[PDB]
Design an enzyme around this catalytic site. Structure first.
Site, PDB file in Angstrom:
ATOM      1  N   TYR A 131       5.295   6.660  -1.084  1.00 48.29           N
ATOM      2  CA  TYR A 131       5.445   7.448   0.007  1.00 48.29           C
ATOM      3  C   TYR A 131       6.643   7.322   0.905  1.00 48.29           C
ATOM      4  O   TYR A 131       7.438   8.227   1.543  1.00 48.29           O
ATOM      5  CB  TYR A 131       3.919   7.953   0.529  1.00 48.29           C
ATOM      6  CG  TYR A 131       3.284   8.156   0.125  1.00 48.29           C
ATOM      7  CD1 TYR A 131       3.214  10.183   0.169  1.00 48.29           C
ATOM      8  CD2 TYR A 131       2.395   7.139   0.232  1.00 48.29           C
ATOM      9  CE1 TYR A 131       2.303  10.585  -1.219  1.00 48.29           C
ATOM     10  CE2 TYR A 131       1.510   8.015  -1.143  1.00 48.29           C
ATOM     11  CZ  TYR A 131       1.090   9.632  -1.444  1.00 48.29           C
ATOM     12  OH  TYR A 131      -0.298  10.060  -2.258  1.00 48.29           O
ATOM     13  N   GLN A 166      -9.947  11.522  -8.527  1.00 48.21           N
ATOM     14  CA  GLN A 166     -11.021   9.979  -8.278  1.00 48.21           C
ATOM     15  C   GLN A 166     -12.406  10.034  -8.153  1.00 48.21           C
ATOM     16  O   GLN A 166     -12.819  11.234  -7.735  1.00 48.21           O
ATOM     17  CB  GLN A 166     -10.531   8.959  -7.239  1.00 48.21           C
ATOM     18  CG  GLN A 166     -10.088   8.149  -7.244  1.00 48.21           C
ATOM     19  CD  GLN A 166      -9.423   7.589  -5.700  1.00 48.21           C
ATOM     20  OE1 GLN A 166     -10.134   7.702  -4.611  1.00 48.21           O
ATOM     21  NE2 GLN A 166      -8.340   6.631  -5.849  1.00 48.21           N
ATOM     22  N   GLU A 171       1.049  -1.073  -5.000  1.00 46.95           N
ATOM     23  CA  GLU A 171      -0.085   0.157  -5.668  1.00 46.95           C
ATOM     24  C   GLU A 171       0.464   1.796  -6.383  1.00 46.95           C
ATOM     25  O   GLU A 171       1.234   1.972  -4.836  1.00 46.95           O
ATOM     26  CB  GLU A 171      -1.469   0.079  -4.849  1.00 46.95           C
ATOM     27  CG  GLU A 171      -0.972   0.316  -3.370  1.00 46.95           C
ATOM     28  CD  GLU A 171      -2.011   1.484  -3.819  1.00 46.95           C
ATOM     29  OE1 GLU A 171      -2.193   1.990  -4.259  1.00 46.95           O
ATOM     30  OE2 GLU A 171      -1.990   2.376  -2.266  1.00 46.95           O
ATOM     31  N   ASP A 219       0.855  -1.431   0.625  1.00 44.86           N
ATOM     32  CA  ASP A 219      -0.115  -0.084   0.388  1.00 44.86           C
ATOM     33  C   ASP A 219       0.863   1.444  -0.128  1.00 44.86           C
ATOM     34  O   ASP A 219       1.969   1.171   0.791  1.00 44.86           O
ATOM     35  CB  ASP A 219      -0.770  -0.005   1.235  1.00 44.86           C
ATOM     36  CG  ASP A 219      -1.457  -1.280   1.026  1.00 44.86           C
ATOM     37  OD1 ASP A 219      -1.792  -2.072   0.115  1.00 44.86           O
ATOM     38  OD2 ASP A 219      -2.389  -1.273   2.499  1.00 44.86           O
TER      39      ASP A 219
END
Ligand SMILES: OC[C@H]1O[C@H](O)[C@H](O)[C@@H](O)[C@@H]1O
Ligand SMILES: OC[C@H]1O[C@H](O)[C@H](O)[C@@H](O)[C@@H]1O
Ligand SMILES: OC[C@H]1O[C@H](O)[C@H](O)[C@@H](O)[C@@H]1O
Lengths: 479, 479, 479
Positions: free
Chosen positions: B193, B335, B230, B189
């Protein structure tokens, strides 16, 4: 397996008068700077600057002999054109068809237009052809009969029939001959036209195109050669080629870099580098002029428009796509006609930085001989010959090459070429670095060998650092 | 190696009440249709729908036990989240840091903001953060001291420090535990970052990001798992992942398909299929909503704007990028919030054709449970909880899933899933076919097995022909 | 020849309960204001608001009898629909096909899809149908056989075969019966679909459409009727009709006027008036909603987009053209759904000015019953029935009509209608007057009779001066 070194793209006769003078200039100036050559078509040909060959098995006496071509092998890799789409109407096979009609044993080698029946207007309109004539040429047989053959390019180029067996047998014969002369890289010219099917665009018809391509690749493999299939169309076809264990072209790079340098923008360039296809042959200039379909999607349309208007306001007419009235449209330009040095406004720093970025891009880099010598648009030649693309096909005498080799910008390019051909970090893995949106940072690593390129697109500066392995010291390339 | 079969994306408690009810629904309805499962985070967590886990080594008791998870392994592949970027502030590790300050043995696990010194205004503006607050959280130590830690997401999510050694040891401990419970595919995930460096965007900083990723990948390989990292950003990162022996996401496909079906246009769709990243996990809907940065360049900007305006005019509010005032810009939308079935206007033919194109796309197809049951935008759920993404996070009782399973469109989707999960041609090689610009033709071949998909985007027709191994004859699939 | 007077467009049962209540309202309110009536389909029908008639020879008893229809003739012109494209699947002819298959004496009356062979994806894509399904319906014969018939609209509407003879024989029977009940103007519904030919759009296929149209025109004339052929496409078809002694529709006017009033612009309106088709029936509102394809070229695209966005931002959803994703595109909108009074924002001065411009436009003007009563968007009906077009198909009781007739805006519209129906200058020649770009000046002259309209689009003022020939003096019309 090819050398991971810079290649020269050159004609048989635009440096001095012939293949012997070409070899003289190569040993005099480039012997430490290149590891291969793409010698453009040197066979007997009667159209289109060599690409209408009577045979792939003979050298035009104007250029030399096969010994002159083999004078390059053994020291350099050799890339040679294989004209898979068509052969000359003066070839033995086609004159036989003229002489004997459909009783000729080579009759099935050509595409007979009337064997398709009526082609509807819709199906005519689909066909992907850049000329504004139907791709059919009517010929007179020896017995006075008239019959029509498929003809994509000029009329002296008669397309080959890959629904028959004779076309494959002909190509296998050429490949065996070319590889026995030391050709280890086969440029497959205009391969996308080999699939004629009414109801389709008759261009890159898949999956049929990949079967033709896998067959040629297999024949080349068993004869000691790899393939460089040539397509000017969407980038996606370059990945299809790569994913089938062949070498694609980095045709996206020249217009992408031109835009990147001219507008001080690294965003699209870095995105392309991160995803660019594997095992490319990269180019900046070619013998053809800067091709626009190859950068769609790679560059947003509005930025391609910027590049087009910027170049066309300053150089010769572009080559248009067929029936395209909108000169400010992406969809209307096929190729800009401009030397790469003139596209960068003869800016020495910008040009060397472009070459460095090319050389740090994954793949084998090709340097076109005009760009090698920082050549400018050849207005006089284009007016002499009437061929637009000659604006980018300068002739040089040997003395003119000696003189051009002394230019500061060419000496900087030689130093780069030597570094790219010789420094071992390029044989390892590519690693892109983070940079801002107006600069690029590119690196190659192989064990202890490591080199790093930084280009500032605002001020056109180029800096290469590399590790001299005997000590750990980082050094500057001085180019 | 994973099964080349359809996978389900599901929460631990939105089908029935827990993992026991999830297994019941799966064995009753999906045991011939899927070969794998991505069960969304089921750990103890205090923010963001499971993505703030106190630990990866426990199941939240409300969902069940590890045995409820091991009930799925042995028949199904198991894809589980690894929140590599951050852990909960209620984790044992961070609670020790509050209690003991910089004398805690876990001090290097977190990023201490003041150890960067002053961050210039320029360097703050670079940071890739989608929220309009600085990514710094001031926390109070037990001794009354205040100190600030880096915080990308909600305040209960504390980012991990990959400049220290503790972060790698923490992840390696999680992976070991997860793999011992049968996890063989790890969704990484928000991995982008993990690289913090002032002067950069602090997001996907290369080459550092790929070193982090190569390390986790190797730990996973020797513990019997593969990785699904991802990233919601430019497509190029998906290829960068792919060439590093990890599974990228097909995030480009959902908005590409939505546009393709709604405007009856196959141009961009076919170009993407021809160039697709390798070994991808494909999705149409996720647990998060249609993400736009992922199709940039894949679709031209004007077509993304078309898709944006079309869905936003009839669906819930989009999630914006940070300080983006232009609601009609590609660069402003992060999104779209809409179920995939509503995005296709609850058109059963269009929805089935989209799933068929997904399943013939190279890679492992994931089907999101709401899309599985052809669920519509859940206005009431979003109103009850205040979470926009709940418009796409429908709950079903076991009874409601039984009922939804009987819908004609869901039975049609089940047939597709059974075919994609079982028919051996997908285990061979992908073959795109020629079509016009309003339809798609896609094929898979593996030996004598062969199946062919034709979708007409004008009328939303879906037709699959395949070779019946039992007979040899070509048949039509009844879906 | 028809009366050069205002006509009413109305349903059989949307003013009161039936045809008797319709006649009551007309004689009570309109006997000096109209000279003709278009009564929308009142036959037995099982789809699409009357446009799926089982037969044209009987009145649905819910509406009344033929005597209720003949109660209007003798004082008013009578315009009735002839659904040339299709008849109901519950018609005696098609039920006979279900019962008797291809042994039915009516088999050749319908289009049997399998008699076209394989239709290529290209030829499917050319077909002009506004629905996202193939226009083919599979039906079960009485003996269990399944066969497919062409079906443009709803499935209860089965298209007629104008390659056969039965279709003309049936239509000639319909026209003979209708004209014997006093219909003297035949609205030819959806005539553009009567030409099915694979390889073409199957819509307005020329030159055959005019051959079908000349034939109906000739049959109608020898039975005492003229024709109003209905087509929504480029205005050029309105001129093609006009040149064949038929009445085209002024579909260009409604969106042209709306833009002209909303944006205070008379440029395009005057250009259209100067060149508009010759024998048209003019409308502002119809029973369908404001149709966009009819104003292409007449209004520039950017000004059509202005109108589309202006209206769609404040009323119900538009009706889309097929597979058209760009909701802000001209090419994507088929019809705006909004009553004409709401499209003008319930602005009484603007609305009355619109009707005056309509009435001074060459041709016979029709006033739709909802526009007669200054009706607003009927959302409650639309929500109740689920049909979008019902926002524009309000029901009124006889008392609700009595009340609406007393509204000041309707009283002004009555004065206009009486004036347009009775003043003899309209029987002469039209003469456009010079105005600035935000006002319109229109005049009619017939001998000594003369009337002049001035409309200021900025302030929505309308003034009519006319000559009282008995006294000679110029007078102002007080409307
Ligand atoms: O006719 C063949 C054409 O394609 C070839 O590959 C060459 O690149 C080009 O110069 C030539 O005109
Ligand atoms: O905060 C972490 C975020 O990234 C995760 O991978 C999920 O996709 C998303 O639902 C979550 O909100
Ligand atoms: O199907 C026939 C269609 O065209 C008719 O002429 C009507 O104007 C319309 O209301 C109907 O829906």
């Amino acid at each position: 397996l090819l050398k991971n070194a810079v290649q020269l793209i050159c004609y048989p006769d635009r440096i001095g008068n012939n293949l012997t003078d070409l070899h003289t200039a190569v040993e005099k100036h480039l012997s430490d700077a290149i590891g291969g050559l793409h010698i453009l078509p040197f066979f007997p040909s009667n159209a289109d600057g060599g690409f209408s060959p009577l045979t792939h098995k003979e050298v035009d006496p104007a250029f030399g002999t096969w010994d002159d071509i083999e004078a390059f092998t053994g020291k350099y890799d050799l890339c040679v054109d294989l004209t898979v789409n068509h052969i000359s109407d003066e070839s033995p096979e086609f004159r036989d068809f003229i002489a004997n009609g459909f009783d000729s044993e080579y009759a099935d080698l050509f595409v007979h237009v009337d064997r398709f029946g009526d082609i509807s207007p819709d199906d005519m309109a689909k066909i992907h052809i850049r000329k504004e004539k139907e791709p059919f040429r009517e010929v007179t047989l020896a017995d006075g009969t008239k019959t029509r053959v498929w003809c994509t390019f000029t009329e002296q180029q008669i397309d080959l029939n890959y629904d028959g067996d004779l076309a494959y047998r002909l190509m296998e014969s050429y490949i065996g001959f070319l590889t026995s002369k030391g050709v280890n890289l086969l440029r497959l010219d205009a391969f996308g036209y080999t699939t004629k099917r009414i109801g389709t665009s008759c261009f890159l018809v898949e999956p049929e195109v990949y079967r033709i391509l896998d067959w040629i690749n297999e024949v080349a493999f068993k004869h000691g050669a790899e393939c460089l299939p040539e397509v000017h169309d969407h980038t996606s076809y370059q990945y299809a080629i790569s994913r089938r264990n062949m070498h694609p072209y980095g045709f996206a790079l020249p217009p992408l870099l031109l835009y990147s340098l001219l507008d001080a923008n690294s965003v699209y360039l870095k995105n392309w580098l991160r995803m660019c296809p594997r095992n490319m042959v990269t180019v900046l200039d070619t013998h053809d002029g800067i091709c626009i379909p190859d950068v769609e999607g790679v560059l947003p349309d509005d930025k391609i428009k910027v590049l087009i208007d910027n170049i066309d306001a300053r150089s010769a007419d572009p080559i248009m796509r067929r029936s395209a009235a909108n000169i400010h449209s992406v969809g209307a330009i096929y190729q800009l006609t401009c030397t790469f040095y003139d596209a960068l406004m003869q800016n020495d720093d910008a040009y060397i930085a472009a070459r460095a970025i090319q050389f740090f891009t994954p793949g084998i880099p090709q340097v076109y001989y005009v760009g090698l010598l920082a050549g400018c648009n050849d207005q006089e030649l284009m007016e002499k010959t009437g061929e637009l693309r000659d604006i980018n096909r300068n002739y040089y005498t040997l003395n003119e090459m000696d003189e051009a080799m002394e230019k500061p910008v060419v000496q900087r390019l030689l130093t780069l070429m030597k570094f790219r051909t010789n420094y071992p970090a390029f044989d390892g893995h590519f690693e892109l670095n983070y940079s801002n949106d107006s600069s690029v940072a590119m690196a190659w690593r192989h064990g202890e060998h490591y080199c790093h390129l930084f280009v500032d697109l605002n001020f056109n500066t180029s800096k290469i650092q590399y590790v001299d392995v005997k000590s750990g010291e980082t050094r500057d390339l001085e180019f």
